[PDB]
Amino acid sequence: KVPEAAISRLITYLRILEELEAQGVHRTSSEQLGELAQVTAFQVRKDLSYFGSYGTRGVGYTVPVLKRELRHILGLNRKWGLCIVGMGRLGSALADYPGFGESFELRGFFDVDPEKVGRPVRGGVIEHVDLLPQRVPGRIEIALLTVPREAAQKAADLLVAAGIKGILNFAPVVLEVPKEVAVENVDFLAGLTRLSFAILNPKWR
């Protein structure tokens, strides 16, 4: 039983590994990765423990191998197809975020208002949500839900139908879906506490 916090740290090592591969760094360690994730080296070695023997020998790790290894663990070895249903303000912005990644790709921006439905979008065009059933299966697994709160639970159930794999949900309402699909809720303001604490702790900061 791997802790939820463990997968989040794993997610952090990977991000720290591409940053490393961006500086021509080839091999690293649990001591370096930890100092960068702000955790104890033991924690890095530990989190990796939940998934098999890693960098056993003193040696350490080599950015390339671990980076690959972590991508496999977090399931980032495939290329998930993404869609943003609820093409409003957040939607239009999200739809244009620069660094989505090599394993995540947008392939559909949906929406119900006719005013938009049909306008070009950096890579494709908006389109109604009545085609969700034969636009999702082969190419879309993950749906970014930036639809108004009230509409959320209704646009949500629509996806579960066109067979959506997972839902990254930005609306302030707890979706109701079958175990067949995963829901991850976003909270852009989550970091305000980290910030709050940092302001009161210069010395620490």
Add this chain to the structure above:
Amino acid sequence: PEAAISRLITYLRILEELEAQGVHRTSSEQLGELAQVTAFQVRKDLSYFGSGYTVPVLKRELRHILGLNRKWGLCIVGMGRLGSALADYPGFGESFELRGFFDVDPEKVGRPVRGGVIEHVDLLPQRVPGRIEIALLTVPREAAQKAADLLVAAGIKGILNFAPVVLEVPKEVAVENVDFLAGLTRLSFAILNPKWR
């Protein structure tokens, strides 16, 4: 331990919920259990500060440590798609209250926003001190650094950065980067592991 703060935050969440449910008292064994961490640890974290326990007292204690006691002034610099949407987001409330919305777009200055109103950016130094400490930087990559430059001069205490760029700001100013990205992978991993889920 830079990692303790993240746990401490987890504890408070586990507490605020224990309270809402009516539970009166908890212990190191339970907090840990619910926070997926050893009692030894939880008991050790609360050690760096003030030290079973009573959900109400520890909650208040944790909140005081985390800063959530006072009521901070917030603001969004850059009322574009992200920033505009953010304004109408009903998730602040508590100890972070929105008290300003700025932008450079002259055709945006004046827009009636939630009772307030989109100011410009030049008043920051007079509008900031005493009223606002935290700014949600939601401007194009290209701007950001120059934006923060003002904000600092305006006397900003901390920035919650959405701009995908690592800002360069003096030490008196705390910065925190915000990303949805991580939740995507948590999603990714969560899909291939219905068991874990």
